Design a binder for these strands. Structure first.
Ligand SMILES: C[C@H]1O[C@@H](n2cnc3c(N)ncnc32)[C@H](O)[C@@H]1O
Ligand code: MET
Ligand code: SF4
Ligand SMILES: [Mg+2]
Ligand SMILES: [Mg+2]
Ligand SMILES: [Mg+2]
Ligand SMILES: [Mg+2]
Length: 354
RNA sequence: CCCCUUCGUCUAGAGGCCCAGGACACCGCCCUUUCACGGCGGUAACAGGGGUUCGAAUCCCCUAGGGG
């Protein structure tokens, strides 16, 4: 029994089940997440008998890091071992903050055409310990909170491999741990779950946890979205934005706005005609816009909008009063930029034959 | 017998620099451009009780909880 699979409720449960008081769950979480301890013999403020009781009944096993790559950006990407397979995790330092992109499945069940995770197939969901484990290893490797004196991580984004809303069972507990004060103590506002639009699971999310929301929109109408982000064929743009607005109603994390992700595919969806449509489309949705220049990956039929097109496109949106930021491209030299995470996946869907 | 207990969390603190300071969280406002969620602001603690002293988070006692 591995305590990295457990959130606070559950660890309390666990400690009651050992005839021991529930504040013990707070102590152990502090060692685990504030110091990145994987070793009960260091928990100096737990009496020696219980300290030993734990070693018999439980453990703290994060997946192992088996690769590391540094970019001129400063950006780092670690590959973690997940049985025979690998998912990948990205650390992004900016001046006043540090951000971890976290993987949430082994590949992705979805088929976005501009995504490299999509082109590897899909194997399985990640367990809680394999999600929060990514935040655990990255915190230890960077410099643990009460070990260097600084928060190693200030923001997390569920923007690694996989679609988060197709693994709510594990995504939510893991986000719960991130937010927890005896966990990493991060902020609602600085944990951004991004989703391609699995509407029912978003409604479900609303009833489970309040967390900042971004959406992989990527087109200004269904005819295009059908082609690049195929799940649109099952939950279309209007259905999705309705769901989004349902989430935003009951959410402090988002501060009344959703972040719109829109990847910039050269001469596909990135002309000023599209910006005009996009502005219209979003007239009834309080948001801010994040333009993402496309990051390439082997075999793709696409190209990256030139900066002139991006610049023009963004200015149209700005005419209509939208906050429009171009996401700086980070980790491209090591295939760690958004979309480039292929990991190592044993596809179980036969993505190839088809 | 000895040591520890200060906002949600980690802490600042040595008889007056403290009706308790910071960071983060939380909450609020704003995002018509700081964004791989951004800017600003605000609420919030001396474990509980009794003493010593002009004055106690700080010194003494008792209690509860925790460690050797
Ligand atoms: C994580 C964010 O990046 C987007 N995304 C997926 N693939 C790529 C790529 N090759 N380049 C840029 N962005 C991508 C997702 O659709 C999501 O919005
Ligand atoms: C590479 S995408 C990562 C998060 C989710 N799949 C989304 O597309 O928004
Ligand atoms: S984009 Fe998000 S959803 Fe679409 S494939 Fe890549 S990962 Fe899966
Ligand atoms: Mg929190
Ligand atoms: Mg306390
Ligand atoms: Mg102190
Ligand atoms: Mg924000």
């Amino acid at each position: 029994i591995n305590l990295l699979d457990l959130n606070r409720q559950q660890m309390r449960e666990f400690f009651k089940d050992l005839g021991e008081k529930p504040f013990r769950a707070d102590q152990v979480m502090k060692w685990m997440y504030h110091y990145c301890c994987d070793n009960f013999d260091e928990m100096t403020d737990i009496n020696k008998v219980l300290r030993g009781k734990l070693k018999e009944v439980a453990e703290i096993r994060a997946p192992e890091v088996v690769e590391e790559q540094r970019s001129s950006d400063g950006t780092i990407k670690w590959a973690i071992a997940v049985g025979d397979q690998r998912v990948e995790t990205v650390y992004i330092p900016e001046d006043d903050r540090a951000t971890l992109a976290v993987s949430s499945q082994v590949g992705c069940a979805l088929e976005c055409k501009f995504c490299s995770t999509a082109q590897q197939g899909f194997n399985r969901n990640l367990r809680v310990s394999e999600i929060i484990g990514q935040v655990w290893r990255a915190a230890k490797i960077v410099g643990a909170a009460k070990v260097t004196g600084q928060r190693p991580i200030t923001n997390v984004v569920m923007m690694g491999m996989g679609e988060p809303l197709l693994n709510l069972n594990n995504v939510v507990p893991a986000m719960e741990i991130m937010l927890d004060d005896f966990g990493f103590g991060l902020s609602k506002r600085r944990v951004t779950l991004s989703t391609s639009g699995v509407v029912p699971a978003l409604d479900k999310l609303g009833d489970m946890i309040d967390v900042a929301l971004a959406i992989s929109l990527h087109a200004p109408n269904d005819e295009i979205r059908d082609e690049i982000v195929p799940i649109n064929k099952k939950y279309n743009i209007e259905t999705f934005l309705a769901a989004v607005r349902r989430y935003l109603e009951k959410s402090n994390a988002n501060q009344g706005r959703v972040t719109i992700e829109y990847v910039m595919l050269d001469h596909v969806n990135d002309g000023t005609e599209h910006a005009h449509q996009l502005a219209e489309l979003l007239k009834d949705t309080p948001c801010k816009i994040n333009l993402i220049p496309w990051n390439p990956f082997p075999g793709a039929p696409y190209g990256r909008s030139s900066n002139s097109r991006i610049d023009r496109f963004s200015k149209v949106l700005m005419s209509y009063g939208f906050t429009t930021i171009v996401r700086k491209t980070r980790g491209d030299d090591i295939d760690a930029a958004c979309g480039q995470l292929a990991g190592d996946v044993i596809d179980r869907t036969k993505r190839t034959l088809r």
